[PDB]
Design a binder for these strands. Structure first.
Ligand SMILES: [Mg+2]
Ligand SMILES: [Mg+2]
Ligand SMILES: [Mg+2]
Ligand SMILES: [Mg+2]
Ligand SMILES: [Mg+2]
Ligand SMILES: [Mg+2]
Ligand SMILES: [Mg+2]
Ligand SMILES: [Mg+2]
Ligand SMILES: [Mg+2]
Ligand SMILES: [Mg+2]
Ligand SMILES: [Mg+2]
Ligand SMILES: [Mg+2]
Ligand SMILES: [Mg+2]
Ligand SMILES: [Mg+2]
Ligand SMILES: [Mg+2]
Ligand SMILES: [Mg+2]
Ligand SMILES: [Mg+2]
Ligand SMILES: [Mg+2]
Ligand SMILES: [Mg+2]
Ligand SMILES: [Mg+2]
Ligand SMILES: [Mg+2]
Ligand SMILES: [Mg+2]
Ligand SMILES: [Mg+2]
Lengths: 62, 206, 144, 99, 140, 72, 68, 8, 141
RNA sequence: GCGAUAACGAACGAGACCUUAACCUACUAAAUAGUGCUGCUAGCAUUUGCUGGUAUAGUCACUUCUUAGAGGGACUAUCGAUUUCAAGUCGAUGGAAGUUUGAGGCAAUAACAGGUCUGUGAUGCCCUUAGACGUUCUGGGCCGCACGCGCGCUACACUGACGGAGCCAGCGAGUAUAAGCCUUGGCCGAGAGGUCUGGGAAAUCUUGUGAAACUCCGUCGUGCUGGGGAUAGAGCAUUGUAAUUGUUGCUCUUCAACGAGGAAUUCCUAGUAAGCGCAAGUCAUCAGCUUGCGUUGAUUACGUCCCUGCCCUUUGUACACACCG
């Protein structure tokens, strides 16, 4: 039961070395429940990344 | 449909390419579609090429790599381990043979299996490390489609390389076995073992 | 130029010049197990004996096998050039020779003591077990 | 005659002034001319080490000496061509005339 | 004279000079038909400018190119550029340019290097290393 | 040191070959060695004759790779 | 980066305070204009100055700019 | 240290 | 339209001209073809011992057809390759001079080439005649 | 740089500048560059065609390729976004070029007991100066081998080795009465090499430096195997007065560790890394070294201060020969 979330805003690089990016995701269906998540690879806005788990927001990383 | 006669005679079969541009004049892009909504825009099969060798500039800007043909990115990752760097004509010959072997086996479109094997090979959640100057503290974060796509090609070709080392099976047919198995999601293949282990560990960090 | 079968004629182990040869190696490279027989030399005696190289070692009959040991032991009689030979312009009789498996190391030592008997520099360094051709030893050959 | 004039120098402006002035003098005088013909310039390169001693990072100088050669073919008697050479004397450019 | 335009295609150092004549559609590489250019895994790179527009455009013209410099692969990109450049240059001069603009759209929409020469050349080597960016291994 | 692939072709091995090769989706240099336990050099001569007799159809011909398939 | 320097920023805005009516919104016209207005030793700097004067002119039509 | 001594 | 040497594949034309020159048998083959290696940089003799000289002669004739006054020093450079210096890096070393020089003498004495003015060896008046036929009997299949 | 502003207005450095690489069918010409026609001429099918050779008198035409001088061209140009609507940044389109267009050259104010008196007929002082520490000759050594370390070259194979065949660069250098340069072409020689003639003080000849990786067809078939080629024996040449402690090259034979490398650690973002060779320097002879050049040609960021180093601000100081205090 994976869920896909289109990206709408690239907040910024987080993590110690800057290798992970905070992003604001919007679900493909039910275009709400917008969540902030961290992504490993390079990201522009409007990239559809699938989520193994949906019920968890994200904040700044160490 | 008409056969056009030139002073320099052109064989019949190769001219039957004016209708459609096909990979090695044998494989069609029309019936290939990515069975993943999330990697359609970063696996490039919309612009057909005859041979997987374009010598383009995909390293100038940031996301130019996604516009490179998925097969040329595959033949690019083949030339590794020092002694093979720059041997692209060898890589195209190797890729070309792999496609034929993938066709006689499972009888599907070889370039469809390539897209399926790559989409089935990218881990969807990886555990990045967040150690604060030495301590172990990994945290599970998501993986963007480009790193998901292009790590699949790296893992797919890396597994084939090691399977052909000190082995009578040729790299093209070690690659063919690696590509078909990852295409079918089989756990026997390398890069599916690896993909499963990353997404398993990432769940153990959230 | 296509597939043929045989039974009982193949010989797994050969014995030539008191050296054991595996019969399933191609003939040109099987003879290289004989010390004093390199790839270049085994290639030529097989061509002088009209023994086709597409054959394994066990495929040959004794008549062919005897035809090879005669040529290697008498190369100059079978149009084998002297510059192609192992031990040419011999020390004692001045004639061109080609020494083989047990004879090679016997006459190689005899060359070594002949160096040691005259107390030459090269013979002494062989005695010490070091490199004789001027190589630097400051930094190489530290094993044992 | 067919007389060839070969021009060599290190600096191009004075060579080119002499080259243009002779053709100019070969213009009011109704003399058929071929040129000037620009030979591929020769880059005389010398790469030394900066250090008079052997200490420091291994840094190198790369000196250069450009040599430009042009040949102009004039079809006139030898007396006419020779007096043009002394009218157009320039210190940098040397002139040799060969039949 | 006759219907002649002359053009050239370039790669890093390889340069292919195209002679475009009026004729039966004779297409040769250094006096040899293009059907036999040894870089064979890449023979379709020079077949691409042909089959994209259709071989019927080459009924009336014959092409003989002279490629020098570069390497085996570098010569193919120079050759395919000289022929493609020759067809466009012939159309601008002996047929209406509306058709020439037709050919120019398909070439660029498929591969820019068919008509526009690639500007990459080798970076000079700098001292302190064996390459342009590579440096000798440092030890402390 | 475990390979010990057979390099001499007997008759039982010969007709077993003609009984097994047809029942292959895909044959190549490695497939005969891998599964018939024959040597690589013997495999190369076997493919070139079996093709002349029609049991095997050449998908592609190349020196470093011979891609073949069954004729049925 | 493409940050213009002080020798071009102050030299570009002096052109505006003295020769605004003759200036324009076209870089090509401005580049030719500046070859008779300023004595610029190098062509690249002439294009650089004219390229920044045009940008400032294009910005004045949207309102008054500071320093001119 | 140093200082040239002769034999002949 | 006619047939030329340039209209035939280099690789399958030479094996076809090589087969023809052996069955005709008039090419004079030196007596050391069973002993020697093609180049000092090589380490082993050719694997096609009986026929290697003919195939090489076909290559030399075709190579000389496409050019003008190729010398004997130039043929050694062409067929020379990278030598396997053991621990030292590889380097290009020329092929054997006698094998190529004997070949041009043998091909010159069967009538296909001849010594050209200003050095080298042009292809003969009849050399063009008979190579172009081989090209025709090359492309019939 | 925008901006804020007891500051205003300026200079060096940076940037500008210069060299190089990429564009110019727009100028200037080129028998030391190239081309089409034309003479003369060869081969193959006859359709008038396709490949060539020849051509410094065809006393042709032309400058696209080639060369180089005068210029032009890009200024982030136009349009979208964000921003204090500023400096700017990111995307597209056009474009040869949109990372300062790529790469370099030059490079401030001071400073270090950094290294060189073994580059100097650059030097002060000290030492020696006729049994010299001067200079020269002969011979040896700088290579010496239980060992530790650094720059590297080959490799551990099949994305490979051989064996044939295909066959493409760019940067450069080159001599006389010498003290001998680059060396084609012919002829000998398995090779290495020898010999006889000729061209070139050079866009002319070596030279299209027909380089190697590379590609094709075969043999090999997972085997310390045809991977790897140390060590060594015997023989043939080259340079040199002189090769022994093998200068180097060649032939046969001998065929070792090595089965991808611990803790650690280096270099690197596009024609870049990596391979692959070639030229120049040293050079009578010797390149596993440097300085460049081109051939094949990628993976991955285009981000951060987690490590490491440096820069700035604040701060403490009993330091100012400045913490080696
Ligand atoms: Mg040593
Ligand atoms: Mg000679
Ligand atoms: Mg070669
Ligand atoms: Mg070769
Ligand atoms: Mg090797
Ligand atoms: Mg021009
Ligand atoms: Mg300085
Ligand atoms: Mg120090
Ligand atoms: Mg000094
Ligand atoms: Mg020393
Ligand atoms: Mg170093
Ligand atoms: Mg090879
Ligand atoms: Mg060249
Ligand atoms: Mg071995
Ligand atoms: Mg070996
Ligand atoms: Mg030598
Ligand atoms: Mg040298
Ligand atoms: Mg050195
Ligand atoms: Mg950065
Ligand atoms: Mg940044
Ligand atoms: Mg820090
Ligand atoms: Mg305190
Ligand atoms: Mg004090």
């Amino acid at each position: 039961p994976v869920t896909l979330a289109k990206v709408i805003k690239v907040l910024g690089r987080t993590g110690s070395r800057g290798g992970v990016t905070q992003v604001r995701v919007e679900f493909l269906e039910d275009a709400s429940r917008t969540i902030v998540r961290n992504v490993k690879g390079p990201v522009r806005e409007n990239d559809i990344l699938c989520l193994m788990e949906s019920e968890r927001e994200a904040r700044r990383l160490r | 449909l008409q056969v056009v006669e030139l002073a320099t005679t052109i064989p019949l079969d190769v001219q039957e390419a004016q209708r459609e541009v096909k990979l090695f004049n044998k494989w069609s892009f029309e019936d290939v579609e990515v069975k993943d909504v999330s990697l359609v825009d970063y696996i490039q099969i919309r612009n057909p090429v005859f041979v997987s060798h374009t010598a383009g500039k995909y390293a100038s800007k940031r996301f130019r790599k996604a516009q490179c043909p998925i097969v040329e990115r595959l033949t690019n990752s083949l030339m590794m381990n020092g002694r093979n760097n720059g041997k692209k004509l060898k890589a195209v010959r190797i890729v070309k043979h792999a496609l034929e072997i993938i066709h006689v086996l499972t009888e599907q479109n070889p370039i469809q299996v390539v897209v399926d094997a790559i989409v089935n090979s990218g881990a969807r959640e990886d555990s990045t490390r967040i150690g604060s100057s030495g301590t172990v503290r990994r945290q599970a974060v998501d993986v963007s489609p480009l790193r998901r796509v292009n790590q699949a090609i790296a893992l797919l070709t890396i597994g084939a390389r090691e399977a052909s080392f000190r082995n009578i099976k040729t790299i093209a047919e070690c690659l063919a076995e690696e590509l078909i198995n990852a295409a079918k999601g089989s756990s026997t293949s390398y890069a599916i073992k690896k993909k499963d282990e990353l997404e398993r560990v990432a769940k153990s960090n959230r | 130029p296509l597939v043929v079968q045989e039974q009982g004629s193949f010989q797994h182990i050969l014995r030539l010049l008191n050296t054991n040869i595996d019969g399933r190696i191609k003939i040109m490279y099987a003879l290289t197990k004989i010390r004093g027989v390199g790839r270049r030399y085994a290639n030529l005696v097989c061509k002088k004996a009209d023994v086709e190289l597409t054959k394994r070692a066990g495929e040959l009959t004794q008549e062919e096998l005897e035809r090879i040991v005669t040529i290697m032991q008498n190369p100059t009689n079978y149009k084998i050039p002297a510059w192609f030979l192992n031990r040419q312009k011999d020390q004692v009789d001045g004639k061109d020779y080609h020494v083989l498996a047990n004879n090679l190391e016997s006459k190689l030592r005899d060359d070594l003591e002949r160096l040691k008997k005259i107390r030459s520099h090269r013979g002494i360094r062989h005695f010490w077990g070091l490199k004789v051709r001027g190589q630097h030893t400051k930094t190489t050959s530290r094993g044992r | 005659h067919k007389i060839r004039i070969t021009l060599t120098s290190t600096k191009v402006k004075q060579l080119e002034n002499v080259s243009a002035n002779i053709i100019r003098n070969a213009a009011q005088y109704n003399i058929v001319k071929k040129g000037p013909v620009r030979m591929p310039t020769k880059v005389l390169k010398i790469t030394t080490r900066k250090t008079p001693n052997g200490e420091g990072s291994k840094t190198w100088d790369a000196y250069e000496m450009r040599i430009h050669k042009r040949v102009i073919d004039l079809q006139a008697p030898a007396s006419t061509v020779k007096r043009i050479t002394q009218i157009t004397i320039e210190p940098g450019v040397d002139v040799e005339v060969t039949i | 004279s006759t219907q002649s335009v002359q053009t050239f295609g370039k790669k890093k150092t390889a340069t292919a000079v195209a002679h475009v004549k009026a004729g039966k559609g004779l297409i040769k590489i250094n006096g040899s038909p293009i059907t036999l250019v040894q870089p064979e895994i890449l023979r379709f790179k020079v077949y691409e400018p042909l089959t994209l527009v259709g071989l019927d455009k080459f009924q009336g013209i014959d092409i003989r190119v002279k490629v020098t410099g570069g390497g085996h692969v570098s010569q193919v990109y120079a050759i395919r550029q000289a022929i493609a450049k020759g067809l466009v240059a012939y159309h601008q001069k002996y047929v209406d340019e509306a058709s020439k603009n037709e050919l120019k759209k398909i070439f660029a929409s498929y591969d820019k290097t068919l008509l526009v020469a690639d500007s990459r050349r080798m970076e000079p080597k700098k001292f302190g290393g064996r390459g342009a960016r590579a440096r000798f291994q440092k030890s402390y | 040191d475990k390979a010990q692939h057979i390099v001499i072709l007997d008759q039982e091995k010969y007709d077993r070959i003609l009984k097994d090769v047809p029942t292959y989706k895909y044959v190549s240099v490695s497939v005969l060695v891998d599964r018939l336990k024959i040597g690589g050099s013997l495999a190369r001569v076997a493919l070139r004759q079996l093709e002349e007799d029609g049991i095997i159809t050449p998908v592609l011909k190349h020196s470093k790779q011979a891609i073949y398939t069954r004729a049925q | 980066g493409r940050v213009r320097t002080k020798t071009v920023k102050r030299a570009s805005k002096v052109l505006i305070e003295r020769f605004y009516p003759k200036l324009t919104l076209d870089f090509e016209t401005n580049k030719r204009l500046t070859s008779e207005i300023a004595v610029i030793q190098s062509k690249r700097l002439r294009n650089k100055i004219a390229g920044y004067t045009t940008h400032l002119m294009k910005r004045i039509q949207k309102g008054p700019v500071r320093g001119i | 240290r140093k200082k040239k001594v002769y034999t002949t | 339209p006619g047939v030329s040497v340039r209209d035939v594949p280099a690789q399958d034309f030479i094996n076809a001209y090589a087969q023809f020159l052996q069955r005709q048998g008039k090419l004079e083959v030196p007596g050391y073809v069973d002993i020697v290696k093609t180049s000092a940089g090589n380490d082993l003799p050719p694997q096609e011992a009986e026929t290697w000289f003919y195939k090489r002669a076909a290559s030399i004739a075709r190579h000389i057809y496409l050019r003008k006054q190729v010398g004997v020093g130039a043929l050694n450079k062409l067929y020379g390759g990278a030598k396997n210096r053991g621990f030292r890096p590889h380097k290009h070393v020329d092929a054997s001079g006698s094998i190529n020089r004997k070949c041009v003498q043998a091909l010159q004495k069967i009538g296909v080439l001849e010594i050209s003015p200003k050095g080298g060896r042009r292809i003969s008046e009849n050399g063009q005649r008979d190579l172009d036929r081989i090209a025709a009997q090359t492309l019939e299949e």
